[PDB]
Amino acid sequence: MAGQNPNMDQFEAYFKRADLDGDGRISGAEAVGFFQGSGLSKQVLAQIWSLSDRSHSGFLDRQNFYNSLRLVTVAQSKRDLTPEIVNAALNTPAAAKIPPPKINLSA
């Protein structure tokens, strides 16, 4: 890969958008407020956070957040973020195949 894979451009941009204060960490409020644009249910939005905030830091690192977006697209793909699905979305080759989710921002 040449680093800048099509999806990753937006994966980053979503991070850049989610990080409201721009300190480089996605705070939960920043995350949740961003994921409001995803069009997913509050349980899912909460869940994606929990699934991405694996360090339990209360902030998503760029990497955590890059995972988070994959999970979003999974729910976007009309799936349920089940243990296997979450693992599927993050911990398999297919995770790289996952596009950036529909985040209603100003587009």
Among 7, 27, 47, 50, binds Ca ion (CB under 5 A): 27
Q: Does 17 bind Ca ion (CB under 5 A)?
A: no
Q: Does 28 bind Ca ion (CB under 5 A)?
A: no
Q: Does 23 bind Ca ion (CB under 5 A)?
A: yes
Alpha helices, DSSP H only, in the chain?
A: 6-18, 28-35, 42-52, 62-76, 83-90
Among 9, 21, 80, 84, binds Ca ion (CB under 5 A): 21
Location of structure tokens 């989710």: 101
Strand partners, 26: 60
With contacts defined by CB under 5 A, how many residues of the chain interact with Ca ion?
A: 5
Contact, 104 vs 37, CB < 8 A?
yes
The answer to whether 70 is a known ligand-binding residue is no
